[PDB]
């Protein structure tokens, strides 16, 4: 395999000008300062940038890059995208299941993983967890060895590494690059970009492409880079790192002065006399949804302290609410305590559904890398993560609250009233979580979407029916009560519970109320708030929460589909 | 000035063993790997560690280090502790005002600053803001030049720099160290510790102290460090950085093998034959409170988008609440709307006082550095920041809410009822902010104290009197209503507003109520909640909020006084 790129003019501002050179099979490196082209040429050569800005051609063996190029070449991210809560065996099985074909037997795929994990030297850590904040795991020198193996499953002919040594120690970074030089003798063209290497690193290369401010300033063998700048008019002292010497020339011991020296070289004309020699899904939907939902569930189990901790809070707060509101009375205080516990239960399900912001935000760089590499669709990534994370973690507190507090408080002792309350708390937990995903999908910070959820809740909670009476608001504000999730949950719990209730002891007021302004029955309270007494007045509130799940999970789908993937 | 340390055994685990050496006036450097002693020896030599673990002696010119050593030597933090919202002129005036004596004239101090700012080369940026997230400021290469000047005001004989090049670029880091070599010829002993230098850096040194895993592995002139390891049995190839060569030996191209080679040297015995030659507040309280409160107020003005943004939210939410609750009626819905707007106003003052967590947390590393250096006391730092940040930012929304919503809603149209409401909203804003400082003082992360404030508020807000009736709770829980800030604010606003009110139109019920269970006057509502109708029943709530300000601002003072400063 030989890359051969020619006359690239990428634009967003033209931050690349014209870069030429071939990349033979060996150990190729792209050096230079940070703001130059060392990170932009690599994303052009690996098709990780938008082709609307690309101008020149990139050729492989005389044939252009097809649409199958992103699946047949491995790109390795700078920071680790490995699942730290799965093991090294399990991370390579997920990559093997969604990239290899479905024809291969599980006996065939497990031997392909055993060839990779033996080649990398991960035999002693093959069944150890990679590591999280809450889990002691494999060290950072072998998280980088793991992520190389997730890209070697399909046996690519071309590897693209993005800063393979940034973030590692000095003794670690030689162990990664001595692994890569053994890979380069197998015939795999390795193309990477190192931030400020050392001479123990620089002595191993086979080609060098030096870039600064979008200008090609050297391309050729890396051994001849020192003798080139000596013959340009510069001098390297003794005991100096040559890779430190090259960026010293960039900063002025100018750019248009030194780029024109490369045009008049014997290296540019030899490259120019080579480029003219050459020029002149995979997987079904149900298999992608099976493995996305399987890995997302092991993550939910392998992180107990954000999953167990929400069940402990639900049980403890369910017992504190059951003790403060222990058995409710049918007296003058009985309307206040029932309307106050049902207001606390619906606005707890809303504010505790702010943790759904974290679902699509933490996994953003792993969604973008795996979508371009071609593991899954957006549709099976979206449905497979709703099925595994959002669905069981929002059913369980809605059951635990209702089982604890219903018989301590002494709510309406019927069997159908028990399950309407469990179902109403469950729809208000989904509708508030779908709203959190409709805001957080696509973003990369948590703190702005967390604040915007909280601002929207405190306006939905004025219009819920406890603080202001909704029949008294002016007609040009009163249409805003239709846009609020705690209104529909608190109307359906109040309708469920206040029906056959009397609240004036010694006064039968359901046949006639003597001396009004009294509120002696639960229908009088419920009409005074503006709630319909028909059985459609209950289930109007559930078809309005179900229509907000479908709208908010479609906005959350289109924000991942229309995302900037490049 | 010559430092001369001898046989240091620091313990928390003995992570230093025995380190010897003198430091003559020049440009001294402390290299090695990160976990070794390069960061721990510097904090011992500058008295920035606890003397309970220190064993050996540190001597200056034959005299031990006094308690005046931290005031007569300059220590420079790694990351910038400069106020990015003040200018370079203003940051040096704050350091000159609290470190120089009060005898000196302002004409004398401004010439001392003009000597410093001309020596550093900050003439073109002398009146430019240093820079924040919201302000375009001076670049990071001259934030480091500024912070050196904040320590050169008292003209110290000994400078201690902590990583003077980590975080800077390669062209920048030579400009800082060429500044330091000009300082070293004036007679200032410069003692620093660089993470992985370059040969353009290494060629400038005058002494070298190489440390790894708490063991002294070289101390002598930095030119002779290369010839020492050649004679130890190692070989440096051509074009290799010698500073990269030294940490290559540490990692194994062992520690107890290579530390014993230094004991048998001609450099250790020459050091050993030198140590036995030698061996054998300032400022008043009112001046510290003047300048702490002055800088903390310029920060409040120079950051408008966290100060103006809380006034915009107060005006906008004050108009939204005034439109939903526009003029209140004395009908059956009148009790609900008055008890709901007064519950929203007190629990808004609590949850918007979570931004007081940010007060003592963001300024933590600048409090610890300036307390050890001896600028101010803990008492004048605490009072000078309550006076400047907490006091005016919690008066203003309590005035803006009360001026907007009082006459739109049509609350009790008396002059004393207008100012009791303004004063009750102001005491509940201080008491919730003092509670936020009593939790956040001493901590260094925001997100744990922000969550712990929010958990405590939602339990204080059940016990406030709207959700559960406080006369109905069991006697073994009902003592918890005394520990809640929204209870005392919402009882004092309900007492203020529900006194002379009638709520049943056509029914005079203040002489006698025909047909009870009615709640036709505001005293009947107010006794039913458990509120005393005497004028002490109003002001009991304000002496209970004033006693929680004094308790929570004493817990917040003792958490800064008893903090681990080392």
């Amino acid at each position, epitope marked *: 395999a030989v890359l051969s790129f020619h006359n690239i003019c990428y634009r967003v501002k033209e931050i690349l000008s014209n870069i030429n050179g071939i990349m033979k099979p060996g150990l190729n490196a792209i050096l230079g300062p940070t703001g130059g082209g060392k990170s932009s040429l690599l994303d052009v050569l690996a098709a990780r940038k938008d082709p609307s800005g690309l101008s020149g051609d990139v050729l492989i063996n005389g044939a252009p890059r097809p649409a199958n190029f992103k699946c047949n070449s491995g790109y390795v991210v700078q920071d680790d995208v490995v699942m730290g809560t799965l093991t090294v065996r399990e991370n390579l099985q997920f990559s093997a299941a969604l990239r290899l074909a479905t024809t291969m037997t599980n006996h065939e795929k497990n031997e392909r993983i055993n060839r990779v994990i033996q080649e990398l030297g991960l035999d002693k850590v093959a069944d150890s967890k990679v590591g999280t904040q809450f889990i002691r795991g494999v060290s950072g020198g072998e998280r980088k060895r793991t992520s190389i193996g997730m890209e070697l499953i399909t046996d690519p002919s071309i590897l693209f590494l993005d800063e393979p040594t940034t973030g590692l120690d000095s003794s670690t970074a030689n162990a990664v690059l001595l692994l890569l030089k053994r890979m380069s003798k197998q015939g795999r063209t390795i193309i990477f970009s190192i931030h400020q290497p050392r001479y123990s690193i620089f002595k191993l290369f086979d080609s060098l492409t030096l870039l600064a401010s979008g200008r090609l300033m050297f391309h050729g063998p890396a051994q001849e880079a020192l003798g080139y700048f000596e013959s340009a008019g510069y001098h390297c002292e003794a005991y100096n790192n040559p890779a430190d010497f090259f960026l010293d020339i960039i900063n002025g011991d100018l750019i248009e002065k030194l780029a024109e020296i490369y045009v008049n070289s014997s290296f540019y004309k030899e490259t120019k006399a080579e480029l003219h020699q050459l020029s002149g899904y995979t997987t079904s939907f149900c298999h992608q949804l099976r493995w996305v939902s399987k890995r997302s569930f092991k993550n939910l189990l392998g992180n107990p302290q954000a999953s167990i901790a929400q069940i402990i809070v639900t049980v403890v707060l369910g017992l504190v609410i059951g003790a403060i509101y222990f058995g409710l009375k049918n007296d003058s205080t009985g309307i206040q305590n029932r309307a106050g516990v049902l207001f606390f239960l619906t606005t707890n399900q809303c504010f505790s559904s702010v943790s759904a912001v974290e679902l699509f935000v933490v996994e953003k760089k792993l969604f973008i890398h795996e979508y371009i590499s071609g593991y899954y669709r957006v549709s099976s990534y979206f449905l497979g993560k709703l099925l595994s994370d959002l669905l069981p973690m929002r059913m369980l507190p809605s059951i635990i609250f209702t089982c604890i507090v219903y018989f301590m408080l002494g709510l309406k002792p019927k069997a159908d009233a028990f399950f309407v309350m469990m179902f109403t708390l469950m729809m208000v937990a989904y509708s508030a979580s779908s709203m959190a995903l409709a805001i957080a999908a696509g973003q990369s910070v948590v703190s702005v979407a967390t604040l915007l959820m909280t601002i929207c809740f405190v306006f939905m909670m004025i219009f819920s029916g406890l603080l202001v009476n909704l029949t008294t608001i002016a007609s040009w504000l009163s249409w805003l009560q239709y846009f609020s999730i705690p209104r529909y949950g608190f109307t359906a719990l109040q309708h469920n519970e206040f029906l056959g209730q009397n609240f004036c002891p010694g006064l039968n007021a359901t046949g006639n*109320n003597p001396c*009004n302004y009294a509120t002696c029955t639960g229908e009088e309270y419920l009409v005074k708030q503006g709630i319909d007494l028909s059985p459609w007045g209950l289930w109007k509130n559930h078809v309005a929460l179900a229509c907000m799940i479908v709208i908010f999970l479609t906005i959350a789908y289109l924000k991942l589909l229309f995302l900037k993937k490049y | 000035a010559v430092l001369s340390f001898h046989n240091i055994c620091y313990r928390v685990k003995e992570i230093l063993s025995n380190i010897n050496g003198i430091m003559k006036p020049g440009l001294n450097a402390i290299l090695g790997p990160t976990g070794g002693g390069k960061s721990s020896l510097l904090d011992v030599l500058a008295a920035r560690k606890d003397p309970s673990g220190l064993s050996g002696d540190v001597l200056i010119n034959g005299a031990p280090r006094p308690a005046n050593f931290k005031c007569n030597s300059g220590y420079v933090v790694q990351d910038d502790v400069v106020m990015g919202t003040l200018t370079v002129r203003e940051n040096l005036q704050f350091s000159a005002a609290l470190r120089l004596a009060t005898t000196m004239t302002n004409h004398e101090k401004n010439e001392r600053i003009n000597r410093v700012i001309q020596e550093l080369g900050l003439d073109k940026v002398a009146d430019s803001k240093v820079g924040t997230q919201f302000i375009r400021g001076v670049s990071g290469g001259e934030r480091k030049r500024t912070s050196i000047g904040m320590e050169l005001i008292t003209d110290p004989s000994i400078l201690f720099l902590d990583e003077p090049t980590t975080g800077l670029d390669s062209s920048t880091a030579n400009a800082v160290l060429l500044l330091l070599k000009r300082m070293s010829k004036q007679g200032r002993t410069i003692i620093f510790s660089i993470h992985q230098p370059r040969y353009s850096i290494f060629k400038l040194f005058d002494s070298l102290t190489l440390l790894a895993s708490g063991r002294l592995m070289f101390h002598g002139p930095a030119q002779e460090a290369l010839g020492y390891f050649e004679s130890a049995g190692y070989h440096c190839e051509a074009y290799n950085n010698p500073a990269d060569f030294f940490l290559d030996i540490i990692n194994g191209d062992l520690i107890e093998k290579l530390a014993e080679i230094y004991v048998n040297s001609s450099f250790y015995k020459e050091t050993k034959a030198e140590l036995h030659q030698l061996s054998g507040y300032t400022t008043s309280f009112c001046h510290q409170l003047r300048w702490v409160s002055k800088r903390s107020f310029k920060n409040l003005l120079g950051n408008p988008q966290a100060s103006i943004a809380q006034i915009i939210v107060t005006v906008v939410l004050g108009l939204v609440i005034g439109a939903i609750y526009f003029g209140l009626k004395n009908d059956s819905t009148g009790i609900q709307n008055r008890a709901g707007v007064l519950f929203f106003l007190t629990t808004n003052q609590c949850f918007s006082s979570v931004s007081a967590v940010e007060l003592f947390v963001v300024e933590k590393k600048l409090f610890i550095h300036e307390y050890i250096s001896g600028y101010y006391r803990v008492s004048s730092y605490f009072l000078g920041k309550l006076l400047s940040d907490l006091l005016p930012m919690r008066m203003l929304p309590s005035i803006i809410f009360t001026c907007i919503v009082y006459f739109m809603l049509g609350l009790k149209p008396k002059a004393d009822a207008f100012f009791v409401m303004m004063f009750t909203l102001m005491m509940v804003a201080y008491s919730a902010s003092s509670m936020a400082l009593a939790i956040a003082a001493g901590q260094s992360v925001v997100s744990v104290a922000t969550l712990l404030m929010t958990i405590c508020f939602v339990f204080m807000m059940i016990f406030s009197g709207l959700l559960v009736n406080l006369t109905t709770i069991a006697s073994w829980l009902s003592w918890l209503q005394y520990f809640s800030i929204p209870r005392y604010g919402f009882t004092a606003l309900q007492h203020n507003e529900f006194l002379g009110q009638n709520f049943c139109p056509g029914l*005079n019920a203040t002489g006698n109520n025909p047909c009870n269970y009615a709640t036709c006057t505001g005293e009947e509502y107010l006794v039913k909640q458990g509120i005393d109708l005497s004028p002490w029943g109003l002001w009991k709530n304000h002496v209970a909020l004033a006693c929680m300000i004094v308790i929570f601002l004493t817990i917040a003072y003792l958490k800064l006084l008893f903090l681990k400063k080392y």
Partner: antibody
Amino acid sequence: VQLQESGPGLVKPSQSLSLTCTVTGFSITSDYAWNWIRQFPGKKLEWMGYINFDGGTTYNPSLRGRISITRDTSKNQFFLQLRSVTPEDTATYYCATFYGAKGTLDYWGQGTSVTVSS
Amino acid sequence: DIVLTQSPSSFSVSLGDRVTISCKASGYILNRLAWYQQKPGNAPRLLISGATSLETGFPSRFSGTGSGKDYTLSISSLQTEDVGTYYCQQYWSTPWTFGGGTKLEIR
């Protein structure tokens, strides 16, 4: 307990209409609410608004800005002031009494007819 | 608001006969319904309060039996002194509305 309307029985269009109901046998500042009801030709009753025993007032939203009810507690009178009068509201105006605890318009006036013509 | 409908706008009965007047509301009134009788040339007079109770000064031939939104007035064995116009008022919500009125006649 004993109510009696009085006022001009004819009024020019778009000026103002004033009535007066003098209550005997009861004090208007003591207990009830005191209101005005009109009955159109082609008889349909229509409530206009009340003044409370404590001076508070409440009006019908279909009569927006045009109605105001005042009282004179020195001699037990309450007043109807209906301004910018159309020739459509040539009704019969009544003053009545609202018990509050019972909820119904218990006592009624005699009724005076107002014709709005030119 | 709440509009009140008396769809039988007239009747035609004889003496000793039972007649029934219906009143329909556009909202839940919760027995806050009153009935009025207006002789020709007089103010209306309260007949029933609270949709069931009867006022002191009326025979026990009138009765109201309503619930929810359907309320009704029954005049069993009417005399000559019972011909008039019958109105229904709600006093639940704050703009108190009346019904259209129904005018009894004698065949």
